[PDB]
C-alpha cells in the first residue's frame, strides 16, 4: 500500500496473509469469508508469465495478523490448505479477467477479536454501493512504494472511478469483471495498492445495515500510485455465482 496509514488493531479482522513456506515470505493478501473459506486473486496462485503455479502444500494462511514479519503468538492462527479453486475462465494472458480464487481450509478457524469473516455482496448491495465517487478501503502488507516494506498492516480509503476514466487511463482492455479506484491528479489526495497487496480485499461499509462487504479483490495496475493511473480490482459480485457454485460443491 502506497500513501496509506497503519491499520488500527482489529480494523480488518477478515484480513488474511498468504505465506510461502520456502523461502519464508509474503505471497499475497486474501480475505476470510467463512470459518473454512478464504478468497484471493487467481494471479496469487497461477501466473505463468512469472512461473508462478502454487499448490496447496506450498503455502499457509495466517489469520488475525497485524505485524507483517512477527509471529503473533496467541493472536494469529495459521491454517493449512485442503484445496485451491481457480476460476476456470481466469485470463492470465491479457488483462487478468476473472482474477479470483477460493481456498478451502483443512480445519475451521476459530473467530476472535482479531479474526472474523467479511460479508459478500448480493445484487442490491452491489447496485447501491458500486458507484463512482463512493469510497472503499484497501488493506495489505505490500510495498510502500512502487520502487520499502511496512512493519504493520496498511490501510487506504479510495473512491471508485467512472468506467470511461478507468478505460481512458490505460491501453489494457477493461472488462465488466473489474472496476478501478483511486484519486485523480486534480483531487490532491493519493493512495493505491501495490505489489504484495494482490488478493487482498477492497471493502465498503453498508450505510443500510452497518456491515462490511468485500466489493473487490486487489488485482492489477501499471506501477503504483502514479498520476492519471488507477488500481484495478476484481468485481466480486459479478463472480458470486462462481463463488456460490464452488462453496455449494
Amino acid at each position: 500500500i502506497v500513501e496509506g496509514s497503519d491499520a488500527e488493531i482489529g480494523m480488518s479482522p477478515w484480513q488474511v496473509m498468504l505465506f510461502r513456506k520456502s523461502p519464508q515470505e509474503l505471497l499475497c493478501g486474501a480475505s476470510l469469508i467463512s470459518d473454512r473459506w478464504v478468497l484471493t486473486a487467481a494471479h496469487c496462485l497461477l501466473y505463468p508469465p512469472w512461473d508462478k503455479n502454487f499448490t496447496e502444500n506450498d503455502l499457509l494462511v495466517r489469520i488475525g495478523k497485524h505485524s507483517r514479519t512477527r509471529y503473533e503468538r496467541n493472536i494469529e492462527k495459521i491454517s493449512m490448505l485442503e484445496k485451491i479453486y481457480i476460476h476456470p475462465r481466469y485470463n492470465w494472458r491479457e488483462n487478468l479477467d476473472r482474477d479470483i480464487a477460493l481456498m478451502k481450509l483443512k480445519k475451521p478457524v476459530a473467530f476472535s477479536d482479531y479474526i472474523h469473516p467479511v460479508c459478500l455482496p448480493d445484487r442490491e448491495t452491489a447496485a447501491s454501493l458500486l458507484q463512482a465517487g463512493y469510497k472503499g478501503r484497501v488493506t495489505g502488507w505490500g510495498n510502500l512504494k512502487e520502487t520499502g516494506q511496512p512493519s504493520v498492516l496498511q490501510v487506504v480509503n479510495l473512491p471508485i472511478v467512472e468506467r470511461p476514466v478507468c478505460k481512458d487511463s490505460t491501453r489494457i482492455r477493461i472488462t465488466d469483471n473489474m472496476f478501478c479506484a483511486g484519486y485523480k491528479p486534480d483531487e490532491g489526495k493519493r493512495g493505491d495498492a501495490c505489489e504484495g497487496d494482490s488478493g487482498g480485499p477492497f471493502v465498503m461499509k453498508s450505510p443500510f445495515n452497518n456491515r462490511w462487504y468485500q466489493m473487490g479483490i486487489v488485482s492489477w495496475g501499471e506501477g503504483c500510485d502514479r498520476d492519471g493511473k488507477y488500481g484495478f480490482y476484481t468485481h466480486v459480485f459479478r463472480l458470486k455465482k462462481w463463488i456460490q457454485k464452488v462453496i455449494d460443491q
Partner: peptide, 27 residues
C-alpha cells in the same frame, strides 16, 4: 449471520478513525 461486524468496532459501537470518510462519500 454475523459477517462484516467487527468485534472491536461494530460489536462494541466503536468507530475506527476513517470509516466516516467512507460514509460521507455515500451521497
Amino acid at each position: 449471520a454475523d459477517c462484516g461486524l467487527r468485534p472491536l468496532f461494530e460489536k462494541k459501537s466503536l468507530e475506527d478513525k476513517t470509516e466516516r470518510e467512507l460514509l460521507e462519500s455515500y451521497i
